[PDB]
Amino acid sequence: MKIAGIDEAGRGPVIGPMVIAAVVVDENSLPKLEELKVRDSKKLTPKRREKLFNEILGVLDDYVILELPPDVIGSREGTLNEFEVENFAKALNSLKVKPDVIYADAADVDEERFARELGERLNFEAEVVAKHKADDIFPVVSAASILAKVTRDRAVEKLKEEYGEIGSGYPSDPRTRAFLENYYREHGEFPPIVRKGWKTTQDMINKST
Numbered sequence: 469m470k471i472a473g474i475d476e477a478g479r480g481p482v483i484g485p486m487v488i489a490a491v492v493v494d495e496n497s498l499p500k501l502e503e504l505k506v507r508d509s510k511k512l513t514p515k516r517r518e519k520l521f522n523e524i525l526g527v528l529d530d531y532v533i534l535e536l537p538p539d540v541i542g543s544r545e546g547t548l549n550e551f552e553v554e555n556f557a558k559a560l561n562s563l564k565v566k567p568d569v570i571y572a573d574a575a576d577v578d579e580e581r582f583a584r585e586l587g588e589r590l591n592f593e594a595e596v597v598a599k600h601k602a603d604d605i606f607p608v609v610s611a612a613s614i615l616a617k618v619t620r621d622r623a624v625e626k627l628k629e630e631y632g633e634i635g636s637g638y639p640s641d642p643r644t645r646a647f648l649e650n651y652y653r654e655h656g657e658f659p660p661i662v663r664k665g666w667k668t669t670q671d672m673i674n675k676s677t
Contacts, residue, residue, distance in 0.1 A: 469495045470529065472567030472594075473608030474556055477616035479548065479575065481637030482666045483644065484624050486541055488552075489615035490559040491524070491531040492567050493608060500527040506610040507603070514621060521618045524611050530565040531612075533619055534558065542665015549576040549585075551665075557589035566592045571606040573613070574598035627661055639666075648673055 474490040493501065501524070509520055525531070536555060544550030552575055560570065574582040583598035599605055603613035628634060635644030651659045652674050658667050670677070 469569060470565055470567040471495050471498060471608055472560070472563070472570045473572070473602075473606060473610070473612040474559060474570065475573040475603050475609050475613040475616055476552065476556075476575075477613065477620040478624075479552075482639055482663050483538070483634055483637035483661055484627055485538060485620065486536045486663075487616040487620045487623075488534045488536065488555050488559050489531065489612045489619065490556075490563060491608065491612045491615065492529045492563055492565045493527060493611075494529055497527050497529075498608065501607040501611050506614060507607055509610070509614055514618075517614065517618055521614055524614060528611075530563050531615065532559050532562045533615055534562075535619060535623065538661055538663035541663040542669065544665070547576065549582065552576075553582065553585045553589060556586055560586075561589075561591045566594070568594050570594050570596050571602060571609045572596060572598045573602040573609055574600055631659065631661065634661075645673065 470492055472490060472492040474488065476486060476488045478484060478486040504520060504523055506524065509517060512520065534555065541551065543554060556572060572583065572586065576582040579598045579600060583596040586598065587596040602609040631647065633643060634647045635641040637644055639645065648658060648662065
């Protein structure tokens, strides 16, 4: 069988793109992922993760990485379920090697619903197994988490070179609020890197509602 894993990176912050990676591995190659100890890579330095990233590509039958710019982030109703179900399926439907079983990270408190909704949006048939923070449970999902994290960290690093001190990207980060506030001050608008779903969603900065 062909097992696939899919996860995201950059869901919390409201600055920069969000990345969704989907990988596919033959069941007989699954072990190779654990031998690389992918599930325990969050502690690695960026360069060491960079190496792990390249190693992972060697065992996959196929994979897809989708870099979602902020201008398109916010296609849902409050709960970021619609946006992720829509894009997770998009990534999965883009694979050349169709998996039979797909393990997926579920942000929605109702894992079962997420798996079901995702499955009905596929252009192919496969069982879906969704779980909260699945990158710590399913090796295949962790592998995907890594391709996503590396891709996003590179994007962010690029953003810091262009705009400078942007903070962590969280609205609760004073440095990030300064960046946003100062930009709007000398531009009368928010920087293009701020996600659509927030600039209009309780953006309590220029609004101060």
